[PDB]
Design a protein around this ligand. Structure first.
Ligand SMILES: N[C@@H](CCC(=O)N[C@@H](CS)C(=O)NCC(=O)O)C(=O)O
Lengths: 598, 598
């Protein structure tokens, strides 16, 4: 577990904290001596009431202060150092988890709830500032000080005292915890009712019409008042239990202290103890009560943080499935790449075979389209080319070589993707376009936004390039979004290009515009382009069309040749698809007639 | 004016805490006397060291305990009593806020963001338990004790002491706040960056594919590390400045205390002051340090909670626009209700009129339907009849009386609504059906669930009637929901009945089933039914059809007679509606073909 330190001088700082820790408590126990000695050093003659104060004691009362102040300053300095340790561990862990997170496989990321992960990794770091704080700011200081104090008690007043001091500390613990763990049975009940009343008031605000259309209002009001009164009663039991907790804690010390001052007064009669000795055993034992109040909030905290920190550790336990083998190839530099599928059988889970023994070629320089109705399996080409997944049977070759043997990072570099639904980042657009390639000159970025015909957006946008998009920002049209994606893939300048269903922008008028801006930028310039559509009309000018059916390659040719082929599937698809376009275009037209008055 | 006093004898409870407060600092200040007395009364002979302890002082050390414990015990009790005051005010405010909110008009409820209201009142109560605690648990107790201690000092030790005690108090405050206000610019910066890292890591996990489809990864890891180091470097400055604060605060009391032991020891030379008196001025002035360390978390809270208490109060400021006049009519008793529109002009925002000078009669007992294409203004009939809004020009009468003169509750009680989208409540269905009329017998609720043909749903449902429906529960189909809304209006048994676009259940077979269930329960039984439809096909059996266009009543008659009327608008609407239904029926057929892998 743990092990934030390995080979460095951060442990230098760690010793320093401990020195400042030890040396802050020494200065603390030293304070009451200076109070006792100063008391005794005044229990004398003074029949000349005009004498100045002996410096011999003037010094001793400075000592009091510069030991009182000394104790705190070294405790603060202990803290300020160790934070430079703590904040360092969190920064280092939060990154290595993130970094290892993306080295993880796609199948993994898809099962995992992204929020279950964002919490797990955040609440993972909280559980470190919870557990390193528990030790260094509380337990170790309270361990040393209690050790030292009972030590001195044995030594200077007798184990008679030390016995009851340490005993009281233990009684304090095994009352604080046995009460505190008990008293969560209220907060977990208070914020319960708080939520009950929270939900009643919310329905009553959303469904405002619904309560209006009926009687009620009063029904929901004293339904609220019901939940409100449950919560009042519950919070009342919290404030009350707290009183009991604080009174029980004080009664422990007050008697512990009171009974000792008795014990001290016998030693003043027995002549063994001075009068300062009374102040000493009082103020000595009292100085332990202060930090003892904190270490009662914890216990559960230490329980919850023990696991919440492991769950964050457990993440990096996860194994990487898709890795490049030993002696991995980079390979070809300046040739156009072709793609071939040899008997590829693949799906997610052996129950679902999606690609059933698929074989075909995607030649270099060409525009190849891959079409098929619902269930075809075109839906999984790119993912296999990008080795996101690996095929269960059969293999996939680029330029005669299996891509398994290629360097998995090298491969992915030459492939550009315009995805069906583009992601935006909570950032500037100018930072979203630049996402294509980081080292882009400002000039490159403008041209690419120009080439894509994204200009009208930034002009229409008041805050221009600096406008914030993302879920937490300004939302833009699908068209402007897909336009941005074209922009990105222009910057990346890949050799192989995928357009995975690029134009399911649910507006035909907008699809037209996008398909043109694409036919301008990606025309046969020794880029090998794969188009994956289900609207064949948008890929009719392809150099090769591969049509899949229930996971297997049925036909394979050009548009005009596939259409003319007797008994072709393409013609069935072209026909329904086209009959459909006329229909939903015709239906849109009539919705319009009914859309406005007459 | 949080008004802890009003008209009840809860102000008796209020005094007790204050009493418990007053009698708790007294028990506190006496503790150094009993410690002093015990010191002086032991500074004597004892030349017989076998004597038992004199009771005169055994009592003096008892007095110490039962004053130390008593002081706290009264402070705990002051708090547990006063919670029973605080918690009560929140409840009282939480209800009248809730109650008055529903007296507000639909337009108000529609503009205000509903979560903003839920935050406002949740954050509203925080600012009361914060300002009631700040007063009774801190400011007053520490003001009272400072006075008492400064009283004692001037009285028994001279203004010499009081001068520097009180000065230390001010020096303490007007440093802490002046420091704390400075040091907030770090937590407001740490959690700033923490949110930056938050969004980075989140974006890199949702758009995990995008970062994979591109270069980057490394780009995003050290975009995180930037924020991570922004946060680390920020969090240290939090710990560093905190150390300064606690050190700076400790310096203040340490010199103040030390300097007084000087000033005290000189009064021991002058024979004026005993040695216990050294303990006395120390511990008295020390016992003022304890609660002062908390009272530094405030000042800003006192500001933030002051406005968060004011915005929550600003709510009841809001004017109720739709209110009944003085001496409002209830009226007609056992007659069927009719509805008539006299020159009604209405819109939201006076510039954009929806209903333009509409006049028509909705005769009693009949089934009246109101149809029209978009812009018609049928879209706003119900809202006006329910006095949600009031017409700009013209009036609306039920049985000859302007509905403005009716008791707005009396009016709304006789109108039942089956809305286009029924709302669900987070509760059982049985409680959602019973919502129609609360005082319904359990049997009544059964007959209604039967009549509505809702029975099949509760049988199909796992936990039967007790099943939890709602957003944070189990969602049911539109058809089942509209089936439940029909149920509710049966329990209500209203005299006037509106079916606002009830069956735009985007599933036709389910529409047909519903219309049958409606036509069975609502047959002219001295109930006057108004249907607002846009598929005229569903209201052809009406007794009167009123057709609106661009806000004005164009034609008005029966189904067959309107159809036959030459140049009628109804035949035009009938025609578009007919073709439209025919198209989307054909389009349903064609999508199915492409929907399957054959
Ligand atoms: N001396 C106090 C510090 C009081 C204080 O201002 N604490 C900060 C920590 S930086 C805080 O967040 N207080 C609550 C707030 O101001 O919202 C303590 O350490 O217990």
């Amino acid at each position: 577990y743990i092990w934030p330190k390995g080979n460095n001088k951060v442990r230098i700082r760690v010793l320093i904290a401990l020195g400042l820790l030890i040396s802050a408590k020494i200065l603390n126990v030293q304070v009451p001596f200076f109070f006792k000695q100063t008391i005794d050093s005044m229990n004398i003659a003074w029949d000349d009431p005009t004498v100045a104060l002996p410096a011999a004691i003037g010094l001793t009362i400075l000592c009091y202060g510069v030991a009182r102040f000394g104790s705190v300053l070294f405790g603060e300095l202990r803290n300020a150092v160790f934070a430079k340790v703590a904040q360092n561990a969190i920064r280092t862990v939060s990154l290595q988890t993130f970094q290892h997170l993306m080295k993880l496989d796609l199948g993994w990321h898809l099962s995992r709830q992204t929020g279950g992960l964002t919490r797990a990794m955040d609440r993972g770091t909280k559980g470190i500032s919870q557990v390193l704080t528990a030790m260094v700011f509380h337990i170790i200081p309270i361990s040393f000080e209690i050790s030292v104090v009972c030590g001195i008690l044995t030594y200077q007043f007798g184990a008679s005292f030390a016995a009851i001091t340490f005993s009281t500390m233990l009684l304090y613990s095994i009352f604080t915890i046995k009460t505190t763990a008990w008293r969560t049975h209220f907060r977990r009940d208070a914020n319960k009712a708080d939520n009950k009343a929270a939900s009643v008031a919310l329905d009553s605000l959303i469904n405002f019409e619904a309560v209006k259309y009926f009687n009620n209002e009063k029904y929901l009001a004293d339904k609220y008042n019901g939940s409100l009164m449950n919560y009042r009663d519950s919070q009342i039991k919290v404030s009350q239990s707290l009183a009991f907790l604080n009174s029980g804690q004080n009664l422990i010390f007050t008697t512990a202290l009171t009974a000792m001052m008795y014990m001290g007064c016998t030693g003043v009669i027995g002549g063994n103890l001075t009068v300062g000795d009374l102040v000493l055993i009082n103020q000595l034992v009292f100085q332990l009560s202060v930090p003892l109040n904190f270490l009662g909030s914890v216990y559960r905290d230490l329980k919850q943080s023990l696991i919440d920190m492991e769950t964050l550790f457990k993440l990096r336990k996860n194994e990487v499935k898709i890795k490049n083998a030993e002696r991995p190839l980079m390979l070809p530099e300046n040739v156009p790449y072709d793609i071939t599928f040899e008997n590829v059988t693949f799906g997610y889970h052996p129950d679902r075979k999606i690609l059933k023994n698929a074989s075909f070629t995607i030649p270099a320089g060409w525009k190849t389209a891959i079409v098929g109705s619902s269930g075809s399996g075109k839906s999984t080409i790119l993912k296999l080319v990008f080795r996101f997944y690996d095929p269960e049977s059969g293999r996939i070759l680029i330029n005669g070589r299996d891509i398994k043997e290629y360097d998995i990072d090298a491969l992915r570099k030459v492939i550009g993707v315009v995805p069906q639904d583009t992601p935006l980042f909570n950032d500037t657009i100018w930072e979203n376009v630049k996402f294509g390639r980081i080292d882009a000159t400002d000039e490159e970025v403008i041209t690419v936004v120009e080439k894509a015909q994204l200009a009208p957006l930034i002009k229409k946008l008041p805050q221009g390039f600096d406008t914030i998009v993302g879920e937490r920002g300004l939302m833009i049209s699908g068209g402007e979004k897909q336009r941005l994606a074209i922009a990105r893939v222009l910057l990346k300048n890949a050799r192989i290009m995928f357009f995975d269903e690029a134009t399911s922008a649910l507006d035909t008028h907008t699809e037209q515009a996008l398909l043109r801006t694409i036919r301008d930028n990606f025309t046969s310039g020794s880029r090998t382009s794969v188009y994956i559509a289900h609207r064949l009309r948008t890929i009719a000018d392809a150099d090769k069309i591969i049509v899949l059916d229930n996971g297997r390659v049925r036909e394979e040719g050009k548009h005009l040749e596939l259409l003319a082929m007797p008994g072709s599937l393409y013609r069935e698809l072209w026909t329904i698809q086209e009959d459909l376009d006329h229909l939903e275009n015709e239906l849109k037209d009539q919705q319009e007639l009914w859309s406005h008055p007459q």
